[PDB]
Structure formats: structure tokens, C-alpha cells
Amino acid sequence: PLGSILFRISYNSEIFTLLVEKVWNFDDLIMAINSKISNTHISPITKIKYQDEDGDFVVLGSDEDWNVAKEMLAENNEKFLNIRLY
Amino acid sequence: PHMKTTKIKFYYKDDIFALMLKGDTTYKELRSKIAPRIDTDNFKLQTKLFDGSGEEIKTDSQVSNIIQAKLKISVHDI
């Protein structure tokens, strides 16, 4: 609804979307992720991957990167996220 | 404005990380950024291109240029 980011997460050969407001840090969003990804039946995970504009997949799990995620988005203000697990 | 930075990625073994370097970032800066991403404090960075064997960002004139040029990077253990 509000200015939140939907974490498109593709774990294995499936897709899961976890919403995370731009006001939260790598935790909440993870806390959010774990809340949506745990359904994969493997582990709560602790790191995520995110597709960059380059056309490849990178990681994200730090305050520095976290800022890159929001900013990388800000540029397009899509309000979503192309995440991937495993 | 508030904090202008660049969106440059990096590749470690089989993983890719993403970092933000301002228009004045030095190598050490760039390197310190990749470290917290990797699982080592002994890692190198290199501009990754069609070959994947570009130049190793060890000096500020490169890392920076990578932030400017938006050059892809590949980090590895040393």
C-alpha cells in the first residue's frame, strides 16, 4: 500500500514476495524475508541476492548495501525488489 | 541532494556484491567496502569485463574510475 518495497524472492524454482517498508533496515526486511522465505522448507536464511541493472544477481545484507538497495531503487522509485535465494 | 554515490557491483568466487562509492572514493575505500561483503579481509578487486580478467583495483585512479565509469568488478581471495 504505502511506499514499501516488495521483495520478489525466487528460491529454487519458485517465487515468493516479501513486503518491506523503505524505513526499515536489513533486519526488519530480513525479519520480513524470513517471515516469507521460511516457507521454502530449508532454513531461515540470513543473506539475500538482488538483481542489479547490470543484468546479473548480487548480494545484500549490510548497511552500506542496504542504502544501495533503496537508492538503486530510488532512481526508478519502482517500490519493489528483485531478490533471489539459493 | 544528500549523498551522491555510485552503484558498482563486484564478484567473489561465485557471488556478486553491490556497493556505493562517492565521486571521490579511493581504492582502500572501495576495498574496505567489499571486505564486509566477503568472508575475508584478504581479497582483491578487479574490473570485470567481457573476459572477466580486467584490471585489479589497487589504486584510487581505478576504483574511482569504476565508480565513475560504472565498471563491473570481481573480488577474489588473495
Could you characterize what this model shows?
The complex is a heterodimer of chains A (86) and B (78). Chain A is of the alpha+beta class and 86 residues long. Chain A has one domain (1-86): Roll (Ubiquitin-like (UB roll)). Chain A contains two helices and five strands. Chain A has a five-stranded mixed sheet, with helices on one face. The longest helix of chain A is centred in the middle third of the chain and has 12 residues, at 26-37. Chain A is globular, with a radius of gyration of 12 Å. In chain B, strands 1-2 form a two-stranded antiparallel ribbon. A two-stranded antiparallel ribbon of chain B has the order 3-4. Chain B has one domain (1-78): Roll (Ubiquitin-like (UB roll)). Chain B is α+β, with helices and mostly antiparallel strands and 78 residues long. The longest helix of chain B has 10 residues, at 60-69. Chain B is built from two helices and four strands, in the order E-E-H-E-H-E. Chain B starts with 5 loop residues before the first strand and ends with a strand. Chain B has helices spanning 27-34, 60-69, and strands spanning 6-12, 15-21, 43-47, 73-77. Classes of the chains: A alpha+beta (86), B alpha+beta (78).
What is the overall shape of chain B? globular
The total strand number of chain A stands at 5
Give me the CATH architecture of chain B, please: Roll
Biggest interface reads:
A-B, 18 and 14 residues
